[PDB]
Design a protein around this nucleic acid. Structure first.
Lengths: 248, 51, 229, 118
RNA sequence: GGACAUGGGUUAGUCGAUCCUAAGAGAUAGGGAAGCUCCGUAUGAAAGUUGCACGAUUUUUCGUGCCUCCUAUCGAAAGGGAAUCCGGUUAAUAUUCCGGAACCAGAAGGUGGAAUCAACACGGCAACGUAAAUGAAGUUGGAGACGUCGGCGGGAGCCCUGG
RNA sequence: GAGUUCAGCGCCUCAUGCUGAAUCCGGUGCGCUCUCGACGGCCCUUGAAAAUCCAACGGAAGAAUGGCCUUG
RNA sequence: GUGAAGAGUUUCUUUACUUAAUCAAUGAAGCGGAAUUGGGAUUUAUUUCCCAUAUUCUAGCGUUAAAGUUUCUUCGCGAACUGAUCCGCGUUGA
């Protein structure tokens, strides 16, 4: 046969389009000021990052060791404004836009850009309108239980930092794209993944679903998890199929 | 002017005779002066009242 | 004087730029510096076999000073001394007897690993001085056992460079004393007695004493704090 | 041994200069393109004649590696005339042509007469 | 005759390349690979060009010391960019030649002017202005530097119209 | 003083020269091309980088002496 | 690899350690422990059983040290301590 499109997406023309992107959205390097006290920064810009629904925030801090200022690229939280003072550290106040360790915050708080490990500069809850809820704590072997946007429950060390509030950008998926042009423009600044040709519309050489006098798969679309590349197409390791008629 | 056309000008033609002249506007300079004075006065007040 | 006023800096978190402080403990050192420091750390960790840990025990300052004072009186001839002796021997040989008629019996410290090992096997070395910093340790790891088997006094001393200094070399792995003068017979006997009271008398005990095996560092204090309460 | 920076940098070494025990080349080469390799021949075409008689400029066949400085020096020391401007051309045949304008105190016609192509 | 033969013809500090970087290419450190070579571009590197008068007659770039998030290059004749116009001239070149009239960059300091009698100007309420109006490191800011469509107003050239 | 138009003299004319005049006064625009200025609409599309240049905060350094003949 | 338990002269498991090995970040930028310290409990008291930090300001600025002694015995913008408590096997975290 032939190498399928999924196998062909290893790079090259399938890389992300990052010319217009302004920078990574890392929180900050976990330093002495954030570990022991707090540090004050000023939000000097709130800008639009192409390919990302949520806005980005350029925040200027003061270097504690050298005569210099450092500009960060926080993920903008809803309600943040330019000229606002944000505080990052263990002793920061429970205010929207501040970055605090998860272990220094009560139960039920809504946060964003949460670290999986203390120092990775934000991993969880970064897309627009998404947030992470702090479910509980455990002082002995200090670890915090949190609820992720997908409903999963994750345990993190009680030193990971998170931003109080919700990622700015509100509900973006509520508006229909309404035409291929909007879909074309949406994915143009993201990558070469649009449009998509159905496998049953191809030939047997191209896709496992191609061929036949009628457009049909001919075999179960649910494929095993331990499937070789080139045949891991369709529904991979599907626990169940059909309409989700009641789920939690 | 173009970026390198400023090199041919004299100093006074690229600057306004004021603090931060040629880098900040007059209103911005006035706001900075007022903000600096007020915050320092309140810092002195907070220090004195902390005893 | 009124103009001279105090302008202190708080240097707290988020207040003032921190002053210049020593950051050596946080400096990313070069690879060779890191290797030679983590090496000593690794030897401090782990259970060291007794045949290697026996070299961590060394003569104290006074005995080492006495030993080296004895060594300095018996040192190999330098280039000038060798040339002068050869010139005198050549001059005397032409118009007299052989070189033995003008040259006295030498008295110097024997050196060289193979030569010293042969002397110990031949029971001719009355004192053996083993360097404690031989990088390939297999060269001298058997020396204490060989000396104990042959019944000759052996001591472990630092600074293989210092051992080589007496023999006018950059480095000596082991030094051997075989013959000494009458005026130094008592000094050699006292040195032998002091050396035997520290190494030969404890050879059997040192065969079963494993070295290293210390956690140290921060975890030693952590264990102490945990065990205190 | 106080280190105020969290980085190690290589110290400064003497870096002694070269003091060779023998010269790699026994004899130094003669100056290449001095004057005579620079100036090959004059040009006496109809356009060249018009340039000499009207613009007070001489036309030459300078070497490909000669620049407007070496051409000026070669002209000065070969014909005792001070150029004021030099224009350089590379002909379609691959050879370099030079337009050398003389000062107002020197007539190109008599200089060309002295050279011997008139 | 764009054919054949013989000669002639392309003139630049200001036009481009050259400089910079984009997508990318690609040494070096290092790691794989039997190897041809592959990955890798401050990457797990002792990756220094630069800031400062300590010697220094006496009015100055020559050997130390202490130093701080620098860094290979290639990659656009449509991207960014220091600076030239008119008239004329040839058989064939011209913003390149000629005549006239300019501009930019770099180097020394050749003059004149300005401030400072005992060190770094004045005026205006202010927006700000001048012929000058001493400014090292360090830091900050701006220009370079930016989509598409639609109408409105102006200017230049062209078009039209009266003598 | 250039260029353009017209009118004459030489009359082989040689440097193709010399000598006369004009090149003036007005107006117009939902006009065409370019450009500038202030705006408005659209984006789940917000629409390069660098070289280079400039400005600011800051205070390193300076030495002219005899109210006048004298320096940076 | 190192130390503790357990099983009817032995190796099966867990329950801990890091120095092997692995992951992540950084200009390997403040890790651990001592000494001072006062709310604090012992208790006719002793930090003895206990953890303590300096900047919430509104879109300003914060660098090339001021001060205190004391070496010179002040051309000194001259040297040192201190201002900036002390010590160390570990760049930090998992």
């Amino acid at each position: 046969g032939r190498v399928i499109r999924a196998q062909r997406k290893s790079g090259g023309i399938f890389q992300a389009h990052t010319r217009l992107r302004k920078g990574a959205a890392q929180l900050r390097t976990l330093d002495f000021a954030e570990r022991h006290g707090y540090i004050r920064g000023v939000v000097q810009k709130i800008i639009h990052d192409p390919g990302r629904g949520a806005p980005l925030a350029k925040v200027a801090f003061r270097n504690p060791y050298h005569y210099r200022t450092d500009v960060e690229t926080f993920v903008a939280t809803e309600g943040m404004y330019t000229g606002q003072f944000v505080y990052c550290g263990k002793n920061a106040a429970l205010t929207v836009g501040n970055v605090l360790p998860v272990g220094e915050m009560p139960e039920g708080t809504i946060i964003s850009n949460v670290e999986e490990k203390a120092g990775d500069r934000g991993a969880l809850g970064r897309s627009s309108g998404n947030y992470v809820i702090i479910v509980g704590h455990d002082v002995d072997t200090g670890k915090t239980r949190v609820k992720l946007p997908s409903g999963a429950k994750k345990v993190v060390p009680s030193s990971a930092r998170g931003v109080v509030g919700i990622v700015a950008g509100g509900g973006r998926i509520d508006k229909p794209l309404l035409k291929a042009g909007r879909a074309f423009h949406k994915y143009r600044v993201k990558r070469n993944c649009w449009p998509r040709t159905r496998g049953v519309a191809m030939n047997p050489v191209d896709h496992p679903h191609g061929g036949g006098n009628h457009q049909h798969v001919g075999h179960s679309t649910t494929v095993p998890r331990q499937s070789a590349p080139g045949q891991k197409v369709g529904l991979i390791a599907a626990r169940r199929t059909g309409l989700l008629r009641g789920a939690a | 002017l173009r970026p390198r056309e400023f090199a041919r000008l004299s100093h006074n033609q690229k600057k306004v005779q004021r603090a931060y002249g040629g880098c900040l506007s007059a209103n911005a300079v006035k706001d900075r002066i007022v903000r600096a004075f007020l915050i320092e006065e309140q810092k002195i007040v907070k220090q004195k009242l902390k005893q | 004087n009124p103009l001279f006023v105090s302008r202190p800096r708080s240097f707290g978190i988020g207040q003032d730029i921190q002053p210049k402080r020593d950051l050596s403990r946080f400096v990313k050192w070069p690879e060779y510096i890191r290797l030679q420091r983590r090496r000593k750390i690794l030897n401090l960790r782990l259970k060291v076999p007794p045949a290697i840990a026996q070299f961590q025990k060394t003569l104290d300052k006074n005995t080492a000073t006495q030993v080296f004072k004895l060594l300095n009186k018996y040192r190999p001839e330098t280039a000038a001394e060798k040339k002068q002796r050869l010139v005198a021997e050549a001059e005397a040989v032409a118009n007299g007897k052989s070189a033995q008629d003008v040259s006295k019996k030498p008295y110097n410290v024997k050196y060289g690993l193979n030569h010293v090992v042969a002397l110990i096997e031949a029971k001719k070395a009355k004192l053996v001085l083993i360097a404690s910093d031989v990088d390939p340790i297999e060269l001298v790891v058997f020396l204490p056992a060989l000396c104990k088997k042959m019944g000759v006094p052996y001591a472990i001393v630092k600074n293989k460079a210092r051992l080589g200094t007496v023999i006018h070399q950059k480095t000596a792995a082991v030094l051997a004393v075989t013959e000494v003068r009458e005026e130094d017979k008592n000094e050699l006997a006292s040195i032998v007695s002091a050396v035997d009271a520290n190494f030969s008398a404890k050879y059997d005990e040192s065969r079963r004493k494993w070295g290293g095996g210390i956690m140290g560092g921060k975890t030693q204090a952590l264990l102490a704090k945990r065990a205190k309460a | 041994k106080v280190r105020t920076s969290t980085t190690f940098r290589r110290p400064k070494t003497l870096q002694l200069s070269r003091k060779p025990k023998y010269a790699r080349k026994s004899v130094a080469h003669a100056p290449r393109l001095d004057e005579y390799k620079i100036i090959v021949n004059p040009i006496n075409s109809e356009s060249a004649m018009k340039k000499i008689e009207d613009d007070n400029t001489l036309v030459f066949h300078v070497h490909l590696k000669a620049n407007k400085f070496t051409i000026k020096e070669a002209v000065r020391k070969l014909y005792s005339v001070e150029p004021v401007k030099i224009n350089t051309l590379i002909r379609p045949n691959g050879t370099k042509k030079a337009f050398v304008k003389l000062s107002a105190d020197a007539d190109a016609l008599d200089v060309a007469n002295r050279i011997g192509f008139l």
